[PDB]
């Protein structure tokens with residue numbers, strides 16, 4: 001509820017998403033890792049929190065909305081009322097970060113995950129605090145619309161190992177990828 005965790009899947013050419021969906025073909029095993037990672041809280045009773053941009057919200061299949069067992073906060077400057085399924089709606093990453101720290105919430109939130117938006121990722125990283133990046137490395141080049149900020153290895157450190165995460169190369173539908181975890185604390 002204090003450290004922030006970004007979770008993204010990026011291609012070799014640091015690309016994410018392409019025209020509404022992801023540039024690469026659907027990787028079912030990568031969704032499982034995404035599901036398990038953002039869904040598993042470390043405490044019984046308390047749930048995980050996921051924050052995402054509005055385009056990301058409507059990208060999730062309607063029947064998989066809201067992401068189950070997780071508190072879903074949608075960010076939007078245009079919407080004035082939370083979209084069906086949305087627990088909370090926030091005007092900005094601060095409105096959201098200050099809401100999450102309210103006594104009323106903190107009592108029921110364990111981990112907070114930023115899961116969607118090149119813009120949200122960017123503003124999440126552009127600010128002090130214990131921050132962690134869970135990156136799924138798609139070992140292949142794809143053409144992408146939107147992208148992901150470069151990782152200053154002078155600011156973040158690669159965790160040799162992290163609990164609950166496996167580090168061996170994975171492969172599905174002929175596409176290779178591996179899980180990585182970076183950390184920053186300032």
Ligand SMILES: NC(=O)C1=CN([C@@H]2O[C@H](COP(=O)(O)OP(=O)(O)OC[C@H]3O[C@@H](n4cnc5c(N)ncnc54)[C@H](OP(=O)(O)O)[C@@H]3O)[C@@H](O)[C@H]2O)C=CC1
Nearest residue numbers: 008009017020021053054055056076077078092116117118
């Ligand atoms: N595989 C992966 O790792 C991921 C891929 N993607 C893909 O990326 C695409 C979405 O990219 P992107 O264009 O960045 O969309 P996002 O949904 O992340 O951001 C777009 C919208 O999010 C809201 N928003 C973003 N930042 C803020 C902020 N700081 N404060 C308030 N509101 C904010 C906006 O509200 P408003 O509209 O009202 O202005 C904005 O128009 C999709 O095609 C998706 O499938 C997304 C996440 C992960």
Ligand SMILES: CN(Cc1cnc2nc(N)nc(N)c2n1)c1ccc(C(=O)N[C@@H](CCC(=O)O)C(=O)O)cc1
Nearest residue numbers: 007008009031032034035059060061064068115116136
């Ligand atoms: C569009 N999109 C955004 C998306 C996709 N892959 C990512 N992968 C990673 N690693 N990180 C992200 N932030 C990420 N974001 C989606 C789309 C669908 C579902 C979804 O329905 N997820 C179900 C998973 C259904 C399943 O695939 O088992 C869940 O309960 O988490 C999630 C995110």
